[PDB]
Structure 1
């Protein structure tokens, strides 16, 4: 408990806020919110605000359903770009049924349920550190995004330099001012691609920070006449954007993944987690990569993962074990992209790891022989398997796997499947200019 009701009232009085954005996240990952004046703040703190819960279902909503808006006090953040006519503050809210029960269709509530299951098994917390990457594009005269990148930088290069501009520096400075724990910030391989790293927090706090980071980055980029995009693969032939997740599991003693007497200084819990993560990777690939553009990133030659394998040092492994040990022991999943919903991805990953721990599965031997060297047939003999190549195949794999369904819940699973099938059907029947360029003149 970081803040209380009285603290929130005092903050609202002293910082002179007149608007509060009670925000939440739908199934598709879009940040939505209800806007209330400061005069209603007390009612908001009484968990008495009603709204339409069907919006959580996204565009596939059918029937209006009334739901409560239980806010979280610890998520109180005051925005700085609010001029002087009253400031704006936000609090991430939980969704509750009218019968005082958390909504099963809320991704945050689902993540809380999965964390409760993990605590039941014996662990304390699930620390996560994300590595989101984003692209910056120049705006047009009509304030519309173009295809021109802001700079032709390189990997870890000092490309933006000093003397103005350097949108990454301004973004990180305002994030630090807003109260974000930023570890580092650097230029990525692709031109105009930047990465900012976070500190390791709890699962829920990390997901909330991810959403707030996306919002703040987009707003600040728009401030400087730029468009910040988190599309997995905005351009062809260039490196994509990833959101590598470094996860660690903790218990009463400390880090559960660390064991000085184990092989690679890894505990049996870490190996069981690896086995669970690798066994069901084909299952949750749809959740971790929920867009059609996502599977355009999962292609060989751009450091994105393409095969289900783990290693400590390899060219684009699905799961990577960083060399750091002790309390910093962690497992990195590299298949996640910034377009994914953080809550759903964390829920499915935690469910897979928990299932692996419960079943005590033995992970396959790590591969370090450049699996890209052989053909598909030459590596299918071993345990190396391909990730789904399209969103439809990933959806089929979701519909087959049961543990991921249990980790998502029936409501979320059904609505996610419906929305993604509509998206796939919409993309399949479209006629793209590629087809015209390839066949209009030839045929």
Structure 2
């Protein structure tokens, strides 16, 4: 029946290829996509045709002047259609070639191109935490309707049918991402029951944002299959339950080299000064997350420390002991735009003085 058809191997019958064009909609947080047939395999982004879509259905264009343009930027293998089919992360433009206001890749790309940034070759490890919900009731997976599971404690990295909710989805996503070519560094179950995490492992400059977005796309397509809902809301349940962040781990060339630790403290120092303006771009609703409790620092203070999960920024024991490595910006919410967060960190850290 139905999976026989979804899983048909096309290679036996044509050279033709399906490409799923993915872009970001009007809200800056909604992923959209559609698919087209291409005459054969393609491995290079610039050999893919540009395309358009109805921007008036995605809050990005008026009905009378409706076309918005898609620029292929990155190709991944499609873990759903498989074979030689592909996913294509895109970028949005007016027909005149202007980037639309919700296109944040463009600015970010500029910054990562700028030669004093490219020289420093910045690395990002982003930790995407999210929460699984039951469809329709919108109540976290594995929670009884109108009630609560036992208090936090056993759920973090836990095992067992009463502790761990949705591993199916997580493991499927892990492999799907690896198969697609995403640099996914690992996964864990989080503190709040029904909450999980994956890491997009050290990725350079613009490709970090590209990868996180596609990772997100893949996640949500998987939950879709499973009949479950995902939120990237930073604090889906009020009270004594963890919120969801997108910790950004960061290092430059000079930070991972001998006596890098000194560059790190300097970079932290710059971040301290631009705290306010980073907060404003670090995802909406973050006030409900960053309270100083539940392994967050208060939104209003800035702090840093060594193995300190209460601080705005944390430096690993490992990198302290080696006088070189990376640090962790814990401030960004799970609904953060990685293009924005990632480039803004480069800018505050290299360019600005």
Give the match for residue 430 of structure 1: none
Deviations 1:377-429 (A, max 9, x none): xxxxxxxxxxxxxxxxxxxxxxxxxxxxxxxxxxxxxxxxxxxxxxxxxxxxx
Q: CA 1:147/1:15 → structure 2, altered by over 3 Å: closer, same or farther?
A: farther
Deviations 1:126-184 (A, max 9, x none): 11001111112233xxxx35314327551222245999963233332333333333333
User: How far off its partner does 1:334 sit?
Assistant: 0.5
**Equivalent runs, 1:42-81 vs 2, <5 Å:** 49=50, 51=52, 59=59, 61=61, 64=65, 68-72=69-73, 75-81=74-80
CA contact (8 A) 1:135 1:194 kept: yes
Q: CA 1:150/1:276 → structure 2, altered by over 3 Å: closer, same or farther?
A: same
Unaligned runs of 5+ in 2: 1-9, 144-148
Structure 1 residue 217 corresponds to structure 2 residue 219: yes
The DSSP-based 3-state class of the residue aligned with 1:92 is strand
Give the match for residue 4 of structure 2: none
Q: CA 1:61/1:122 → structure 2, altered by over 3 Å: closer, same or farther?
A: closer
Structure 1 residue 279 corresponds to structure 2 residue 276: no
Looking at structure 1, the residues matched to 91 and 314 of structure 2 have their Cα atoms a distance apart, in angstroms, of 33
User: How far off its partner does 1:111 sit?
Assistant: 0.7
CA contact (8 A) 2:123 2:203 kept: yes
User: How far off its partner does 1:211 sit?
Assistant: 1.1
Looking at structure 1, the residues matched to 193 and 132 of structure 2 have their Cα atoms a distance apart, in angstroms, of 9
Q: CA 1:25/1:222 → structure 2, altered by over 3 Å: closer, same or farther?
A: closer
Give the match for residue 338 of structure 1: 334
Looking at structure 2, the residues matched to 163 and 300 of structure 1 have their Cα atoms a distance apart, in angstroms, of 26
CA contact (8 A) 1:17 1:89 kept: no
Looking at structure 1, the residues matched to 70 and 196 of structure 2 have their Cα atoms a distance apart, in angstroms, of 35
User: How far off its partner does 1:355 sit?
Assistant: 4.2
Give the match for residue 324 of structure 1: 318
Give the match for residue 266 of structure 1: 261
Q: CA 1:12/1:349 → structure 2, altered by over 3 Å: closer, same or farther?
A: farther
User: How far off its partner does 1:273 sit?
Assistant: 1.8
Give the match for residue 111 of structure 1: 108
Q: What TM-score do you get using the length of structure 1 for normalisation? A: 0.63
Looking at structure 2, the residues matched to 122 and 21 of structure 1 have their Cα atoms a distance apart, in angstroms, of 30
Match of 2:252 among 249, 253, 259: 249
The DSSP-based 3-state class of the residue aligned with 1:288 is coil
Looking at structure 2, the residues matched to 77 and 347 of structure 1 have their Cα atoms a distance apart, in angstroms, of 22
Select the structure that is richer in helix. Answer: 1
Q: CA 1:288/1:207 → structure 2, altered by over 3 Å: closer, same or farther?
A: same
CA contact (8 A) 1:276 1:355 kept: no
Give the match for residue 19 of structure 2: 20
User: How far off its partner does 1:303 sit?
Assistant: 1.2
Looking at structure 2, the residues matched to 22 and 88 of structure 1 have their Cα atoms a distance apart, in angstroms, of 11
Which is higher, the Rg of structure 1 or of structure 2?
1
Looking at structure 2, the residues matched to 243 and 121 of structure 1 have their Cα atoms a distance apart, in angstroms, of 23
Give the match for residue 308 of structure 1: 302
Give the match for residue 133 of structure 1: 129
Give the match for residue 29 of structure 1: 29
The DSSP-based 3-state class of the residue aligned with 1:282 is helix
User: How far off its partner does 1:192 sit?
Assistant: 1.2
User: How far off its partner does 1:94 sit?
Assistant: 3.8
Which range moved further: 120-129 or 199-208? 120-129
Looking at structure 2, the residues matched to 315 and 49 of structure 1 have their Cα atoms a distance apart, in angstroms, of 44
Q: CA 1:164/1:236 → structure 2, altered by over 3 Å: closer, same or farther?
A: closer
Q: CA 1:231/1:162 → structure 2, altered by over 3 Å: closer, same or farther?
A: closer
Give the match for residue 182 of structure 2: 180
